[PDB]
Amino acid sequence: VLLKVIILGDSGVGKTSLMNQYVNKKFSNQYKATIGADFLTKEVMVDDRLVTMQIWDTAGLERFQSGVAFYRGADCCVLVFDVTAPNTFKTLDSWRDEFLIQASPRDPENFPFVVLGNKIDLENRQVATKRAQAWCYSKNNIPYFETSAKEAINVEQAFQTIARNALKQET
Amino acid sequence: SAEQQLLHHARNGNAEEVRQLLETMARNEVIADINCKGRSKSNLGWTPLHLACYFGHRQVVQDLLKAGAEVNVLNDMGDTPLHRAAFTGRKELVMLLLEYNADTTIVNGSGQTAKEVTHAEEIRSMLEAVERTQQ
Numbered sequence: 001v002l003l004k005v006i007i008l009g010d011s012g013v014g015k016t017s018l019m020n021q022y023v024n025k026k027f028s029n030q031y032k033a034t035i036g037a038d039f040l041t042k043e044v045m046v047d048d049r050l051v052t053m054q055i056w057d058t059a060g061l062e063r064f065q066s067g068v069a070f071y072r073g074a075d076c077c078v079l080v081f082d083v084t085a086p087n088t089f090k091t092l093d094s095w096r097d098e099f100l101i102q103a104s105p106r107d108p109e110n111f112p113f114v115v116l117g118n119k120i121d122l123e124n125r126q127v128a129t130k131r132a133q134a135w136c137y138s139k140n141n142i143p144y145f146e147t148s149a150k151e152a153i154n155v156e157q158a159f160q161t162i163a164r165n166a167l168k169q170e171t
Numbered sequence: 172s173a174e175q176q177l178l179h180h181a182r183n184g185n186a187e188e189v190r191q192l193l194e195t196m197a198r199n200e201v202i203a204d205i206n207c208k209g210r211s212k213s214n215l216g217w218t219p220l221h222l223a224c225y226f227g228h229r230q231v232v233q234d235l236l237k238a239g240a241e242v243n244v245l246n247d248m249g250d251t252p253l254h255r256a257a258f259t260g261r262k263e264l265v266m267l268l269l270e271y272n273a274d275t276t277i278v279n280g281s282g283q284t285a286k287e288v289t290h291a292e293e294i295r296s297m298l299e300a301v302e303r304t305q306q
């Protein structure tokens with residue numbers, strides 16, 4: 001059982017850091033921008049089944065973005081923003097919309113999204129929890145998690161729902 | 172922009188704003204192509220009809236068709252609105268597109284007709300009968 005998960009979001013919101021925290025329990029304060037799109041694979045337990053998640057990390061910077069052909073086949077799409085950078089929340093509608101038309105799921109209203117509001121360990125938060133939750137609920141109840149890749153807060157919990165919903169979608 | 176508004180409201184199924192947009196285009200109050208294609212990542216190469224069919228906005232599709240939207244427009248994948256409606260199993264939209272004389276023989280960029288991309292048996296069988304006749 002191979003599950004394909006795409007991580008999307010603006011540059012610097014913490015996509016690579018959330019993936020590295022989940023997969024290798026590691027975090028770096030240094031920033032190294034992602035180029036293009038590539039994946040790693042990780043074995044995960046969903047209830048009592050062991051599955052393999054193929055996790056695609058993507059470039060947030062437009063100059064390093066390539067095509068979106070790799071969207072096809074995704075079982076779940078993860079939308080990441082930075083709670084201290086409100087414009088990264090505002091782009092979520094267009095990230096989701098571009099995924100839907102380019103990946104073209106058969107049932108777009110029920111395709112599984114998960115939204116992570118990352119960097120809750122920082123001061124100067126700008127996006128309110130209630131605002132993010134209301135948007136998520138308005139899109140047919142997208143599950144919403146607040147995370148810190150740096151402090152490893154709710155990362156495992158988020159990816160457990162990601163894996164569970166991708167498994168349901170794949171089946 | 173009136174076309175960006177049209178693409179936004181068609182994708183999101185805001186039927187009244189679509190109707191207001193069309194009745195206003197009907198009177199030349201605005202420069203607006205009813206068959207415009209999107210330029211955003213959010214709608215690149217899609218018409219308002221494409222968007223409303225894929226996302227299942229029946230009333231928008233009716234208003235667009237009644238207002239003369241071209242039924243056989245193509246997107247960058249070679250899909251017609253019929254393809255998109257057949258793909259997502261929207262029987263009532265497939266019927267409405269046939270009512271406006273949608274061509275069922277159009278083959279998309281990956282070599283498939285609307286009949287060939289559906290999973291709804293009621294849609295596949297119904298498009299088989301029409302395509303039999305239309306061909």
Ligand SMILES: Nc1nc2c(ncn2[C@@H]2O[C@H](COP(=O)(O)OP(=O)(O)OP(=O)(O)O)[C@@H](O)[C@H]2O)c(=O)[nH]1
Nearest residue numbers: 011012013014015016017029034060119148149150
């Ligand atoms: N304090 C704090 N810093 C974080 C957190 N997550 C990521 N960072 C930092 O934010 C910066 C950007 O993180 P990245 O994971 O590289 O962001 P990205 O989304 O992968 O960026 P692109 O590859 O350019 O699209 C890095 O300097 C990280 O150390 C977090 O939860 N808390």
Ligand SMILES: [Mg+2]
Nearest residue numbers: 015016033034
């Ligand atoms: Mg990165």
